[PDB]
Amino acid sequence: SRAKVENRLSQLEGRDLRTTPKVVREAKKVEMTEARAYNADADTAKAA
Amino acid sequence: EAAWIDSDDEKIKVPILVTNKTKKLRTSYNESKINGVHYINRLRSQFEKIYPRPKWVD
Amino acid sequence: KNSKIFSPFRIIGNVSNGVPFATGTLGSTFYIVTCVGKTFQIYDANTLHLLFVSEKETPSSIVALSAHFHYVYAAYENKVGIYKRGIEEHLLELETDANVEHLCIFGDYLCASTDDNSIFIYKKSDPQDKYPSEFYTKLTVTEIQGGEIVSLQHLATYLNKLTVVTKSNVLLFNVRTGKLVFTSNEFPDQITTAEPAPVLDIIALGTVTGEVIMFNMRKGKRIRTIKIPQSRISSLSFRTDGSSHLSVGTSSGDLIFYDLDRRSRIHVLKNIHRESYGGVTQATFLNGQPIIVTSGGDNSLKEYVFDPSLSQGSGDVVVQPPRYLRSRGGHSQPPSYIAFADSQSHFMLSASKDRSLWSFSLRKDAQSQEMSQRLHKKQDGGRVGGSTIKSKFPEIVALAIENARIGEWENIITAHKDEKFARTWDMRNKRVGRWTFDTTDDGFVKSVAMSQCGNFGFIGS
Amino acid sequence: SSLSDQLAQVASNNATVALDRKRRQKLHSASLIYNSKTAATQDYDFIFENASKALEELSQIEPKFAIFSRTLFSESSISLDRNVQTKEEIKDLDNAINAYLLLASSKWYLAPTLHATEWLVRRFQIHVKNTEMLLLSTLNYYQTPVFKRILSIIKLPPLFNCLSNFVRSEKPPTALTMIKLFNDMDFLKLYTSYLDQCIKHNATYTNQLLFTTCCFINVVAFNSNNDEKLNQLVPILLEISAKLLASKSKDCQIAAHTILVVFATALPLKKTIILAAMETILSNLDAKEAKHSALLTICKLFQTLKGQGNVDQLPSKIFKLFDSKFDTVSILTFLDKEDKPVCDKFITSYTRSIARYDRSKLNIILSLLKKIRLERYEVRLIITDLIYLSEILEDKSQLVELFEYFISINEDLVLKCLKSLGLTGXXXXXX
Numbered sequence: 001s002r003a004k005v006e007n008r009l010s011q012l013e014g015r016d017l018r019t020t021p022k023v024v025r026e027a028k029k030v031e032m033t034e035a036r037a038y039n040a041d042a043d044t045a046k047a048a
Numbered sequence: 049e050a051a052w053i054d055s056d057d058e059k060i061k062v063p064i065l066v067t068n069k070t071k072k073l074r075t076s077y078n079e080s081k082i083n084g085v086h087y088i089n090r091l092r093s094q095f096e097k098i099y100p101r102p103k104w105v106d
Numbered sequence: 107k108n109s110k111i112f113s114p115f116r117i118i119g120n121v122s123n124g125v126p127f128a129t130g131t132l133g134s135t136f137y138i139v140t141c142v143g144k145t146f147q148i149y150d151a152n153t154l155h156l157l158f159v160s161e162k163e164t165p166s167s168i169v170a171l172s173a174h175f176h177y178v179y180a181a182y183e184n185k186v187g188i189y190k191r192g193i194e195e196h197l198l199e200l201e202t203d204a205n206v207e208h209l210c211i212f213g214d215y216l217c218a219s220t221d222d223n224s225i226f227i228y229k230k231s232d233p234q235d236k237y238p239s240e241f242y243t244k245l246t247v248t249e250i251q252g253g254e255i256v257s258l259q260h261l262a263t264y265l266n267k268l269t270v271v272t273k274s275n276v277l278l279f280n281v282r283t284g285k286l287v288f289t290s291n292e293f294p295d296q297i298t299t300a301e302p303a304p305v306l307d308i309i310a311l312g313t314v315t316g317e318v319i320m321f322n323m324r325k326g327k328r329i330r331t332i333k334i335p336q337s338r339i340s341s342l343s344f345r346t347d348g349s350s351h352l353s354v355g356t357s358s359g360d361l362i363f364y365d366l367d368r369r370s371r372i373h374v375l376k377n378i379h380r381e382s383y384g385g386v387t388q389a390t391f392l393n394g395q396p397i398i399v400t401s402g403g404d405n406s407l408k409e410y411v412f413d414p415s416l417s418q419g420s421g422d423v424v425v426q427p428p429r430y431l432r433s434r435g436g437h438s439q440p441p442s443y444i445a446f447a448d449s450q451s452h453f454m455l456s457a458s459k460d461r462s463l464w465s466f467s468l469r470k471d472a473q474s475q476e477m478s479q480r481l482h483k484k485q486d487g488g489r490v491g492g493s494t495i496k497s498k499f500p501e502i503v504a505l506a507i508e509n510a511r512i513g514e515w516e517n518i519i520t521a522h523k524d525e526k527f528a529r530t531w532d533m534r535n536k537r538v539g540r541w542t543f544d545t546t547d548d549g550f551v552k553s554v555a556m557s558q559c560g561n562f563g564f565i566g567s
Numbered sequence: 568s569s570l571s572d573q574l575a576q577v578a579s580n581n582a583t584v585a586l587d588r589k590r591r592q593k594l595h596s597a598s599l600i601y602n603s604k605t606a607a608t609q610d611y612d613f614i615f616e617n618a619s620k621a622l623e624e625l626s627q628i629e630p631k632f633a634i635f636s637r638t639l640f641s642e643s644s645i646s647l648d649r650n651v652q653t654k655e656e657i658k659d660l661d662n663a664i665n666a667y668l669l670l671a672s673s674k675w676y677l678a679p680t681l682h683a684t685e686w687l688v689r690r691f692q693i694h695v696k697n698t699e700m701l702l703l704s705t706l707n708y709y710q711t712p713v714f715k716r717i718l719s720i721i722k723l724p725p726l727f728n729c730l731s732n733f734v735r736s737e738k739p740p741t742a743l744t745m746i747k748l749f750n751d752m753d754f755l756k757l758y759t760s761y762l763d764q765c766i767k768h769n770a771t772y773t774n775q776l777l778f779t780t781c782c783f784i785n786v787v788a789f790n791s792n793n794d795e796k797l798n799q800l801v802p803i804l805l806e807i808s809a810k811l812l813a814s815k816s817k818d819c820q821i822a823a824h825t826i827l828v829v830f831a832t833a834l835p836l837k838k839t840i841i842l843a844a845m846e847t848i849l850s851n852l853d854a855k856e857a858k859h860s861a862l863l864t865i866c867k868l869f870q871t872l873k874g875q876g877n878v879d880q881l882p883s884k885i886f887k888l889f890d891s892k893f894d895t896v897s898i899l900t901f902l903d904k905e906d907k908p909v910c911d912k913f914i915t916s917y918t919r920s921i922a923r924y925d926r927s928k929l930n931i932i933l934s935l936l937k938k939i940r941l942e943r944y945e946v947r948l949i950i951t952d953l954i955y956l957s958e959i960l961e962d963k964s965q966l967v968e969l970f971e972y973f974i975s976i977n978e979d980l981v982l983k984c985l986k987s988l989g990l991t992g993x994x995x996x997x998x
Binding site for chain 4: 370371416417418419420423424426
Binding site: 023025028035040041043047 | 131134136151212213215233260262263264266346347392393394395411414429
């Protein structure tokens with residue numbers, strides 16, 4: 001009978017009172033950023 | 049090492065100081081005509097500066 | 107077929123058709139250039155506004171699209187075309203009767219590949235020319251060198267080398283001399299796509315069986331074999347920001363992202379394009395930024411963003427899911443009915459066989475919307491019918507709109523195929539209204555009308 | 568955007584650099600042991616005097632901290648600050664702190680450890696800069712007051728927002744709010760990186776692995792309703808159980824067995840995936856205490872999946888791996904236990920692989936059938952393979968002894984399948 005009171009108490013103490021807000025998933029503003037690339041006209045070359 | 053060797057890539061003598069994109073590939077200031085094997089080695093290192101080398105390829 | 111009363115303006119309501127589009131860097135901004143049938147369009151990246159279309163339509167369908175910094179290269183039936191601003195600046199003719207299928211441009215050497223295994227090389231006459239015009243040579247791939255030309259790519263830091271991928275092997279061509287310099291070993295699968303990589307001498311090959319074979323072209327050996335279960339691979343691209351992300355796009359409407367550092371998956375986007383129209387035809391990252399632009403045969407073009415990580419310190423492990431952004435689209439089907447929403451010739455309502463209803467705009471082509479089929483709550487307090495797994499309305503066959511009293515109640519009555527009630531739509535709110543009008547004699551509706559005052563709607567059983 | 572939201576981004580970046588004495592007062596009052604007034608009125612050397620005594624006590628306990636005496640707890644590590652050093656060396660300072668916390672996550676019930684990490688809080692600002700690895704290290708001690716102290720010091724990352732009501736709270740966080748933390752999809756991947764770094768540095772102990780199993784089982788149980796969510800949760804806990812099985816310890820193997828059982832019981836899987844679950848369990852199993860747990864896990868994993876070919880023959884690679892890692896006598900003595908768990912689908916799949924591959928030891932299935940009680944369709948599939956064995960094998964009389972058991976009990980079943988394949992009277996002629 002003490003175990004069932006202890007099991008009731010474990011259910012009672014684990015019962016939280018106030019709300020737990022979950023992980024906030026909000027989109028941030030994403031902007032175009034300047035980035036580098038490769039030029040193909042320097043990749044070509046002319047014969048001697 | 050190398051699975052192919054381009055025989056017509058050594059005789060070429062490209063200029064470097066004629067276009068502003070290639071003008072960052074000079075190391076001295078009295079070099080303008082540089083052969084292809086030095087030029088394609090320089091352009092490899094410049095491409096390694098522009099795009100980095102991630103670890104999964106190695 | 108000429109007319110003395112009407113003359114064609116453009117084709118309102120199209121974004122893409124299914125051809126692999128091109129994108130070109132232009133300073134900091136990017137332009138997404140697609141083609142629609144006998145013309146082609148230029149879309150900006152940061153707003154997806156239409157910028158330029160072709161001034162004069164091509165005689166046939168556009169097969170290959172490529173774009174340098176300013177000059178967009180379109181490739182229709184026999185000839186390739188160099189365009190700027192939509193204006194036909196130069197027409198480059200291929201002196202063969204076969205059809206052009208793929209079009210690569212690197213340097214002064216334009217690389218046009220016909221369908222019958224011939225690669226044409228076009229040279230700039232002047233080193234300061236803005237596009238190649240003279241004809242250099244005609245490379246030929248025989249039946250002993252490989253299959254048909256799947257794609258033409260030019261890998262980085264290769265001096266006058268063209269990378270050709272066949273259905274069975276990869277070849278290299280010294281285009282200044284027109285000579286084969288290296289052949290790859292045979293690939294047992296049929297290669298379907300090719301893409302260069304930010305790492306040097308690396309090309310990514312996607313096969314019809316879901317294998318991504320990642321071929322180091324210097325050593326002539328593959329490195330990473332990424333397996334996808336039984337899915338046809340159509341698109342390949344790399345996120346060039348610095349984080350190791352490989353985007354592989356299946357033709358079954360799936361987009362799979364791989365973290366090459368951790369050898370693990372990231373996310374499998376489901377149904378970003380429909381199955382029957384080709385799926386994810388072309389999907390690539392903007393160069394250096396976490397925005398991927400996807401397009402397919404479903405007449406749509408979506409943008410997805412990889413958000414920065416929620417963890418402040420970990421970073422590379424906990425990566426964010428891709429998230430929907432700007433998208434422009436049209437009907438996947440031909441449109442059945444068209445009406446006009448106002449006297450200003452501004453808005454056009456089009457109901458298609460794709461079970462939808464769009465409000466296009468003749469004035470600004472980015473003002474178009476898909477009018478929402480989200481049912482209003484019933485006034486009685488009783489739950490409405492229909493399926494829990496939501497599907498669209500049936501195909502609309504008759505339509506009527508009165509623009510007199512707009513926005514204070516419903517002003518569109520649309521009639522669907524094989525339905526015993528017509529449906530109301532509010533044009534100002536761009537949403538299905540809260541009233542359905544039964545025929546009350548067990549009958550499909552074949553005609554509907556409005557009064558000019560707009561208070562009364564007529565229903566024909 | 569607006570102005571003040573950009574300012575909080577600057578304020579979160581510069582929350583460790585002291586500008587006024589008020590900012591120094593509100594940063595030095597962060598204290599693991601002392602109160603607020605004593606923390607504000609003590610110098611860096613006075614903290615370091617207790618710190619050098621703390622790490623000397625810890626070096627007596629385990630000698631892995633003897634490295635950290637000369638890199639993080641040197642007397643030269645006083646004048647330097649994180650906010651004066653550039654980005655190429657603050658990364659080296661970050662993982663050195665993360666290497667210390669992993670090597671000191673086990674040692675936390677001792678007051679020498681709390682004195683040692685107190686100076687790391689004050690001198691290197693780890694309660695603001697790298698708050699994640701600190702909170703993951705002490706997460707298994709949430710009942711203890713040192714976690715209530717740590718929440719009262721730390722600033723919470725956006726991922727541990729479920730503990731936002733438990734900072735400066737007189738009651739400790741409970742069991743239910745820890746599962747609500749672990750129910751987040753992204754936090755499971757971050758704990759995967761923490762666990763993979765925990766296994767790779769070879770410091771994994773009982774208490775944090777008991778707690779990690781106690782939350783991994785619940786997060787499958789809390790997501791047992793949503794089948795879409797458990798599909799999204801499959802590549803995390805299987806990759807964890809892949810890395811946990813790859814560990815050579817006596818503890819990670821049993822902890823990987825606990826994850827692999829309840830996940831498959833709450834979610835039936837493809838046969839080839841659970842076939843890979845056999846080979847990863849069977850590969851590095853050498854602990855004596857983990858051999859009994861591994862046999863019950865493979866027992867439970869086989870009865871989870873249902874379908875045609877459920878009890879078919881195993882591959883020869885898996886069968887010879889099971890023969891080496893488990894003797895036939897060992898699985899017979901396992902069946903001798905009067906608890907006798909539900910091994911029915913595994914045994915009939917084991918003996919069909921016995922009849923196919925070795926084709927020599929049929930005395931075991933005589934002892935296997937007498938020990939276990941089997942269902943109807945599993946007996947039919949055994950007899951059908953033994954009938955196929957009667958066709959091809961040069962029939963010794965022990966095969967006749969095996970069918971003598973098959974006619975001793977349920978003789979209509981062997982007679983019916985003999986009518987399906989062959990003649991009833993031809994059995995005596997063939998055996």
